[PDB]
Assembly symmetry: D2
Homo-oligomer: 329 residues x 4
């Protein structure tokens, strides 16, 4: 019995006795993700290089992928009639949906995560977090300022060697592989769980001169294990979505702590940290700033940044122990 994302979302909606907005919202996200994936794989690029001459395009139309991905998500999400407030990594202000297309959900997303990797063709993706409108007053950015703990759904689409959508909800994380031949997401891994301990650490060591003492000690242990065990392997794709997905399926730890230029970390809380922390916790993993659970942070700005350490429980707990140690004084 093959299960598609459409059938999965549909069934989860019935068992939850929902009106249907969530189901319509997730269906729309699915459609947006497929449209972004096709664009990312460069389908139709021949037209941009004049295969049919230049009789159609009479003006600027060469949209960058990150801009195009943003337009697809915003437009497709709006046409779902299930959202009221949208927060995008590419927009300064929150987007308030017209009354005519207004729904009950708040969506925070990162249209094309891994900007620096776009031009070198390295894996990139889309990250999303979904909240249910809390207050009863007019929708505003405030509706997006909820602790990740309030998330009803979160996940990401990875445009890697293949395109995969990872969806996390109250009862677990499920992985769907996109079959581009039929434009259908196929459930390939249900109720995913991260391993208790991995053997890979992921972090940009270029900021070494600015790491706090705990991060410094932890990395030293990965390379020169005090107990003489085997050193961990290192991997840093440069796109959060790619490094986090590898962490989920292979185990290990991912880190982006604070540094000189980024005193409160670089990654954004609403559409990078929280969605990933939610997926991680639903998979049996941990996500911390090194001092507190990411999902417990109360956002004060829609573009707020936060340090983040996530991955296998035992690996993240070891780092937390080091932070506690350097705080005991």
């Amino acid at each position: 019995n093959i299960v598609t994302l459409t059938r999965f979302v549909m069934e989860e909606g019935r068992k939850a006795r929902g009106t249907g907005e969530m189901t319509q919202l997730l269906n729309s996200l699915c459609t947006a993700v497929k449209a972004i994936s096709t664009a990312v794989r460069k389908a139709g690029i021949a037209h941009l290089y004049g295969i049919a001459g230049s009789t159609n395009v009479t003006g600027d139309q060469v949209k960058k992928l990150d801009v195009l991905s943003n337009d697809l998500v915003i437009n497709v999400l709006k046409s779902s009639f299930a959202t009221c407030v949208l927060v995008s990594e590419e927009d300064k202000n929150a987007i308030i949906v017209e009354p005519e297309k207004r729904g009950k959900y708040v969506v925070c997303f990162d249209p094309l995560d891994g900007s620096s990797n776009i031009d070198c063709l390295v894996s990139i993706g889309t990250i999303f977090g979904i909240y249910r409108k809390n207050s009863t007053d007019e929708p505003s950015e405030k509706d997006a300022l909820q602790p990740g703990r309030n998330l009803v759904a979160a996940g990401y689409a990875l445009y890697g060697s293949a395109t995969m959508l990872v969806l996390a909800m109250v009862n677990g994380v499920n992985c769907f592989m996109l079959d581009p031949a039929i434009g259908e997401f196929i459930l390939v891994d249900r109720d995913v769980k991260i391993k208790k301990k991995g053997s890979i650490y992921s972090i940009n060591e270029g900021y070494a001169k600015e790491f706090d003492p705990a991060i410094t000690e932890y990395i030293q242990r990965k390379k020169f294990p005090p107990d003489n065990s085997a050193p961990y392997g290192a991997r840093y794709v440069g796109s959060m979505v790619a490094d986090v997905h590898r962490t989920l399926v292979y185990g290990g730890i991912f880190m982006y702590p604070a540094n000189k230029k980024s005193p409160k970390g670089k990654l954004r809380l609403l559409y990078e940290c929280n969605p990933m922390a939610y997926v991680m916790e639903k998979a049996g993993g941990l996500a911390t700033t090194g001092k507190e659970a990411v999902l417990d942070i109360v956002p004060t700005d829609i573009h707020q940044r936060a340090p983040i350490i996530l991955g296998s429980p035992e690996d993240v707990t070891e780092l937390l122990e080091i932070y506690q140690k350097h705080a005991a004084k």
Copy 2:
């Protein structure tokens, strides 16, 4: 006008007034790469998950991507009637083409580089090097034991966010993007040249405990610039093809030195180091083991390994100076 890979190779073939055997070889390579890309992107995966029931399957047809990639390259290259000897990262022995389909070219290739990144969907690719048989004796593995400097063509196909084929030849390096909508590689970057100096270093620091003093000094310098400039950023996808491609388009340096487990380096000379070194040099970059030019090494084993350092001239040269410094003490 628009230039497809097919027209590019055809044209280049006519320029050097060739019999067309090399042209057919490149055409076949193009076909193999497109076929591998389609499989990598998981087209038709729905059938494996029973969309059409379990009536189609009759045995145990569950070929892993790496085995499929190897079968595709081998079968397609043989069908080109342009090769006599094939060396694959997946085969312990060189493959001697039957007399009927025998051609004069020797091809060394890595069907699906980035084995550890296959399951986590991170970028992977195909690497190839082409030599002309320089002998009259019956074809044997010895025909593949030529220094990289003898290559007539080399390159790789990167199955990342998009699929790109990079081809280096005597005249230079050119990049073609695969437009999956029409199955055609489109020339998008002519006579590519790498930046003289970059700002990214790429290495698996998990082997820090095993690096020689030169590698160690260089890495420290990247994190703690003596001139107090901004430290280099770090990136290590884990797939040579992906890290090297980024090195080529963004500049910087890629390293895989020797360590305890790999005293002679891990990467293989014939289908990993040589092809990438040739692409690098044709692009104005450098490729060294730290003590000699990769392309000058005369191999004695088709699966010979070698340490490798490649990338922007100034960056590689800086590391070479550290090596030369220690050897002068």
Copy 3:
């Protein structure tokens, strides 16, 4: 506001306050149609011709398209958990769905209509009719023996120059174009209505020697109009789905009356005639055997055949007038 089939089916389900089975059933049909379309367009045929050699397929697996289409519909429909009885043009007996996957709907379908056109690559398609389980006793073929008038939904997917799905339900016919780049059916024509009168007649005139007097007279009028108006144009693709679709969008008339070898017509009532008659009537057209409305016929066999004349109201009414004339005696 772009509308996809998924969103259309979802909304129609909500407005109807249905449990969700219909929506799941239509979603499944959508998925099956995309899988058949990709196969029909021959994606992956290179593998059948040995592009990767012959290492996987160790036995028979070269399924004919008509057989494959049948497996996809049956399997996908079953996994919807919304059906109890299935009638296929390719199966002698009705298919009774397992209690575990049993739903309330009865589906009659023609997996790949236009058998004679399969090998010459002329347009072919899939036709479907959906009934709601009436009786309360165990499901049997009897549940499929309902007059077309009881249909809750019907339509077809045309695999022509492009793939299109036409869906007819209680309040109208809607046309969805499949965008293969994203595997998404896009609503392109809503609440379709056939023109009152067309200028094209479609019938296999090869059976002329066996046509009844009314058909003979009608065809004579199309070629030699008694009032000297312009003669009608003739078109007969040979695939009912193609000829009927053209009739719907261009207007005119389609005919397949009785003949020597086919005394009660050739087309089957449950999965060819009724579905098309329903689409036609919902579009403001007519569908008759020449003596009675197709949708009013009470089926006595699941593979019962029936003569059928359908299309623009004025064109079909003219033929009915001729039948009445030749019956007045």
Copy 4:
């Protein structure tokens, strides 16, 4: 082994030791056809219906398929540097290629045959004929006014249930199926030969009132066989490319004789009749106006029309005997 169109043309080019200009011309044609097929199948249509909002569009970029097909062929053929004169069914005047991209071949083509079938999604296609410039004078339309017998290559691409390219050359007719998954034409039928006698006749009988006595007698014979055998079945898709392809693979006969509106026949000699006549004769079939061989007609107008009868030898010959009979009374 597996043979792609690219390898087939390349090989054939080497056999006749050509400079490779014809090879590049065929390669370009292959690219144009794949691009047309993708558009015909409606890839990316979702963008036209606002999936990404209305920010991409800036003017009135709504090119109809026929105009797009014409722009693709023209642009791609010019980019081949192998042509000097182009004749399109869509252009009133012959297109003379600029001196820079000038080659020695003259190409006559029908970019999207079956205009009336475009909107109803019935099979459509591209027809082409290639001549070598036989003169030293500056290229002009006169170079395209050669009898079909001078063709060096001709064929068509049928965008039906699947996309197939049929190529005829001095040595024979070969059929290649387009595998859209990898964008490659695969040889699936070598040295095709039409059946000596068929069982299908194809003509628009709507012009019955205007047919000459020979056509009328022949059709009556197909419906009322004097030998009392089974009558021929009828088929008329309405797109020459589709009806002719079926004629080639199933045998039988295709006819488009003169009528009141088209006293010299409707189909055009240079890009409809000649290409199909050449394919037919290379396949062992016949092509006549009823009074002379189509390939022997020396045109005086690039848009010259001609009556045409083509298909299985015995069938065509039977009709010719009727013509000869009347001319002998």
